[PDB]
Amino acid sequence: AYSNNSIAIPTNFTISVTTEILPVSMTKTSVDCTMYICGDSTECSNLLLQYGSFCTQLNRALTGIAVEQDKNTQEVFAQVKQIYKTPPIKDFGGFNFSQILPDPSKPSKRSFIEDLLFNKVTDLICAQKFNGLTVLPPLLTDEMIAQYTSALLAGTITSGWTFGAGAALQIPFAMQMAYRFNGIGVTQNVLYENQKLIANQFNSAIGKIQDSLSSTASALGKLQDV
Amino acid sequence: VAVLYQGVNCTEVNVFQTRAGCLIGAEHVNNSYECDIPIGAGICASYQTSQSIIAYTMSLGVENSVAYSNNSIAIPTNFTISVTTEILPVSMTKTSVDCTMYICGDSTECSNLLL
């Protein structure tokens, strides 16, 4: 409807959590020119050397892709050089973050959501190593990228936005939403009165994300094309 | 020089084994420092102490546990104005290559065959 004297203002709201899956790096590969022609023979080497520097250019090309490819994970995952830890005593004001936080009881450090991301994406490594194609491993293993992830979650949950502009400053997460509502022009009264309702909205939203990732495996197709 | 083999344990061959493969000629130190020349799978190397090449695990930086409480708050009483450097490229060297002089110069028969 369109009218000059008519206006619509929202009387209620909801907290929705969505998912965008963005790829960072690909698999590092280096292919030899001589072994791609043949090995254990001097006929491939004498006839291959007359074409010049093609081997050097294609080899430095695969090395350059692998170094810049390592640099993308370095420019994204680790923003800061300081590690943050999760406190043992958890009072968040009624919010349950245990799904996104790592579980120390597991042999490898991972969260409940990341446990599903590794299991829903597809040994093939030894199968490729049997035919002569060497897959170079990434410089950062899964435990250190997950430790970078646990550092940014533990820091945003406790210190928030402070460590980006300086030393990490401890703020209660209940007061963190007061400024996040104050930044978009919303009075903190919605937070302080509706905090009990927001606890059930957030905990149910995390349960819906866990159910969507477990039931639907096609949401990860952004990485599956890669 | 520290020779590294990729994707195989030590078979033929300070001989240690990593996830990337057999690494010979380097020493393994249990302590961890900041990496300089990277290898892969969280291990790097540097020339340190009668000095040689040492190999060690990636340090992810200083581990600090930030205190968290309901009534606790920290407000800064002082500030520091710092100036940093962001370096970015814009243009690259302009090159122009001619097909005739590059392929065959000073040749009329070859210049006619290229047309």
């Binding site: 302080y192 | 407000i75 800064p76 940093t84 962001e86």
Partner: protein
């Protein structure tokens, strides 16, 4: 610059390879064999040198795509960081951005950014609200802090302690909803003015 130099050097040095012929100089082959036996060897040079130039043109163009992604990022920082003030975090550099100084540099530009970072910190006691007459009071800008004696209102970015007043807060809701509210006395500047009157 080193990558461009190494690319040009490889491009020239590839001319000396024979590419399946007797020799790399075209004048010695054209000066010995007749034209009908000669066309096979010149065609071998043509196919090889064409493939080397096609790799160079494709590789330089791939770097042109890198130069355009960097140019669009530089033009975005030139607009937001330099001309105006960007509120984006870690865009204009670490910290809260203030102003940018451009400097000419060979084949690029160097940015000197002035940022605002805190230095010394001190632990304080906080409360979400102040209960005075039975109605809650919330800070308009900033948070409630205390040194252990009196509750103060201060900004999050820097410490400038001020007395709790009616212009610094606003009356909304009551004291039984908000969790963590504490009791204290909210100073009203109209009261001593009327007492003196």
């Amino acid at each position: 610059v080193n990558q461009n130099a190494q690319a040009l050097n490889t491009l020239v040095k590839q001319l000396s390879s024979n590419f399946g012929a007797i020799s790399s100089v075209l004048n010695d082959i054209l000066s010995r064999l007749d034209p009908p036996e000669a066309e096979v060897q010149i065609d071998r040079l043509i196919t090889g040198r064409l493939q080397s130039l096609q790799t160079y043109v494709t590789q330089q163009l791939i770097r042109a795509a890198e130069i355009r992604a960097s140019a669009n990022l530089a033009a975005t920082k030139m607009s937001e960081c330099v001309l105006g003030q960007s509120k984006r975090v870690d865009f204009c550099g670490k910290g809260y951005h203030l102003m940018s100084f451009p400097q000419s540099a060979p084949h690029g530009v160097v940015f000197l950014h002035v940022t605002y970072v805190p230095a010394q910190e001190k632990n304080f006691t906080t409360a979400p609200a102040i209960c005075h007459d039975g109605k809650a009071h919330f800070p308009r800008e900033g948070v409630f802090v205390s040194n252990g004696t009196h509750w103060f209102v201060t900004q999050r970015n820097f410490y400038e302690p001020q007395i709790i007043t009616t212009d610094n807060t606003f009356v909304s809701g009551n004291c039984d909803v908000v969790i963590g509210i504490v009791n204290n006395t909210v100073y009203d500047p109209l009261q001593p003015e009327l007492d003196s009157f």
